[PDB]
Amino acid sequence: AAALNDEFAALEKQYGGRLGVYALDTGTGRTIAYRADERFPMCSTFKALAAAAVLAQVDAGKESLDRRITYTKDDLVDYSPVTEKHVGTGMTLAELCEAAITYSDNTAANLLLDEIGGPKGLTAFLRSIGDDVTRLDRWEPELNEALPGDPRDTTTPAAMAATLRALLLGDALSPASRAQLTDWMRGNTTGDKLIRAGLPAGWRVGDKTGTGSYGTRNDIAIIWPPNRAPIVLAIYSTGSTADAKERNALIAEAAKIVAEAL
Ligand code: NA
Description:
The PDB classes it as hydrolase. With 262 residues, this protein is α+β, with helices and mostly antiparallel strands. 40% of the residues lie in helices and 18% in strands.
């Protein structure tokens, strides 16, 4: 409510820009919503959805995770630490999903989009599982432009939360794929300074980060506290004016506030 809105508003003033939060404690049904229905640029948070879409093709017997994908240097875009090592041998869809999630590998993400029907295909998938809000329009790296007032390549914290819940806890995917997406997000290496840094120590998190222009910094996660039902958390921020270290701190702090209020 208003008291809590004041706190998130103080963060927005502190860092500049615009902050969105949706959190849901599945064990009590309590939620936190701040700009939860406003659009924010997804940046790399879509890569979890891209992997999901590949898994959904496998569930439907139309695809195999072992299938080897060949690619060239014409496919390499910036920030592709994993794929930039396997041009010669190629990589499997499993390896590409893992790389896109755990290392936010841009080239791997574009490759997943290839096998999925592109941004329009990924969006189509999202509609198929009840997400009528989230939209991907472009490929890496252009999708990170994060232009103010631009609806392309956006979600809302509430839509992304609902979607992540369906994918990781609901029945949008088979048990095997759901478990596989779960393992990948838990194995993320890019999220240490963000949601993970704001939560109490013993809480297990699977997450996917995002970084983009106009000072965009995001993180979406499922959280498994000991002896409790899981929490779904989507945090988006854009437009802030702060260094890399403190954009990280903005997200961690919002996460910390959430754990106190939820
Ligand atoms: Na990113």
